[PDB]
Enzyme design. Structure first.
Site, PDB file in Angstrom:
ATOM      1  N   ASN A  46       0.881  -1.167  -0.027  1.00  0.00           N
ATOM      2  CA  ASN A  46       0.179   0.081   0.062  1.00  0.00           C
ATOM      3  C   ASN A  46       0.966   1.300  -0.229  1.00  0.00           C
ATOM      4  O   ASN A  46       2.102   1.187   0.469  1.00  0.00           O
ATOM      5  CB  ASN A  46      -0.985   0.036   1.133  1.00  0.00           C
ATOM      6  CG  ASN A  46      -1.793  -1.231   1.285  1.00  0.00           C
ATOM      7  OD1 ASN A  46      -1.970  -1.797   2.344  1.00  0.00           O
ATOM      8  ND2 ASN A  46      -2.322  -1.665   0.348  1.00  0.00           N
ATOM      9  N   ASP A  48       1.064   3.785   2.161  1.00  0.00           N
ATOM     10  CA  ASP A  48       1.490   4.043   3.257  1.00  0.00           C
ATOM     11  C   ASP A  48       2.671   3.225   3.661  1.00  0.00           C
ATOM     12  O   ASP A  48       2.829   3.335   4.964  1.00  0.00           O
ATOM     13  CB  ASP A  48       0.365   4.201   4.302  1.00  0.00           C
ATOM     14  CG  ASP A  48      -0.117   2.896   4.590  1.00  0.00           C
ATOM     15  OD1 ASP A  48      -0.015   2.091   4.027  1.00  0.00           O
ATOM     16  OD2 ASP A  48      -1.273   2.907   5.731  1.00  0.00           O
ATOM     17  N   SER A  50       2.263   0.075   4.493  1.00  0.00           N
ATOM     18  CA  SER A  50       1.577  -1.259   4.885  1.00  0.00           C
ATOM     19  C   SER A  50       1.466  -2.466   3.865  1.00  0.00           C
ATOM     20  O   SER A  50       1.760  -1.835   2.631  1.00  0.00           O
ATOM     21  CB  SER A  50       0.299  -1.101   5.608  1.00  0.00           C
ATOM     22  OG  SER A  50      -0.564  -0.509   4.779  1.00  0.00           O
ATOM     23  N   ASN A  59      -4.731  -6.324   5.974  1.00  0.00           N
ATOM     24  CA  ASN A  59      -3.675  -4.922   6.071  1.00  0.00           C
ATOM     25  C   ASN A  59      -2.703  -5.118   7.349  1.00  0.00           C
ATOM     26  O   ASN A  59      -3.439  -4.908   8.405  1.00  0.00           O
ATOM     27  CB  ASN A  59      -4.514  -3.966   5.841  1.00  0.00           C
ATOM     28  CG  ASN A  59      -3.655  -2.652   5.473  1.00  0.00           C
ATOM     29  OD1 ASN A  59      -2.328  -2.531   5.804  1.00  0.00           O
ATOM     30  ND2 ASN A  59      -4.179  -1.641   5.046  1.00  0.00           N
TER      31      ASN A  59
END
Ligand SMILES: C[C@@H](O)CN1CCN(CC(=O)O)CCN(CC(=O)O)CCN(CC(=O)O)CC1
Ligand SMILES: C[C@@H](O)CN1CCN(CC(=O)O)CCN(CC(=O)O)CCN(CC(=O)O)CC1
Ligand SMILES: [Cl-]
Ligand SMILES: [Cl-]
Ligand SMILES: [Cl-]
Ligand SMILES: [Cl-]
Ligand SMILES: [Cl-]
Ligand SMILES: [Cl-]
Ligand SMILES: [Gd]
Ligand code: NA
EC number: 3.2.1.17
Length: 129
Positions: A46, A48, A50, A59
């Protein structure tokens, strides 16, 4: 492991995910198809930093520990690698926590955009379950 459709449906049903929090089995199968293409080993990073893991793309920001999402939580109390196993138990148990957290299945982006509001029974049609 890449599950077949009916194979995954049967495993999800056996693990009590069918009708869990009011979401019929086809919702879960549809979500898994578009999240992971039924592949337990799926991983995606992702923006960010993560990562999402496994058939239901759970996640590391909140739900599992991967050792590289600084400041994150591990609310399912598992290494994220447990979500990549051929045995879907850990993914199912963690998904049950996620879908209970207030947002329902809207936690899964592919479900909201590609499954929600559709004929989801089509995803279990033809299976012996
Ligand atoms: C419904 C949203 O709340 C989902 N949520 C978004 C982020 N939340 C927002 C907040 O809780 O205000 C902050 C972090 N949240 C703290 C907590 O929940 O106590 C932990 C993770 N949560 C666990 C859960 O919510 O059950 C999942 C993601
Ligand atoms: C930091 C904010 O989360 C404060 N929070 C604002 C509203 N939240 C937002 C959210 O949780 O996404 C929704 C309701 N919230 C659900 C839950 O928390 O499980 C219950 C009450 N919360 C309990 C808590 O958060 O400790 C206190 C108020
Ligand atoms: Cl199958
Ligand atoms: Cl269904
Ligand atoms: Cl981490
Ligand atoms: Cl935690
Ligand atoms: Cl709901
Ligand atoms: Cl989440
Ligand atoms: Gd939260
Ligand atoms: Na984490």
């Amino acid at each position: 492991k890449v599950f077949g459709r009916c194979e995954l449906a049967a495993a999800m049903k056996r693990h009590g995910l069918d009708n869990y929090r009011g979401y019929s089995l086809g919702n879960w199968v549809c979500a898994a198809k578009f999240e992971s293409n039924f592949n337990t080993q799926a991983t995606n990073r992702n923006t960010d930093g993560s990562t999402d893991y496994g058939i239901l793309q759970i996640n590391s920001r909140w739900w599992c520990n991967d050792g590289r999402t600084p400041g994150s939580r591990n609310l399912c109390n598992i290494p994220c690698s447990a979500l990549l196993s051929s045995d879907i138990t850990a993914s199912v148990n963690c998904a049950k926590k996620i879908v209970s957290d207030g947002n329902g299945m809207n936690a899964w982006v592919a479900w909201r955009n590609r499954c929600k509001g559709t004929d989801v029974q089509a995803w279990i049609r033809g299976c012996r379950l």
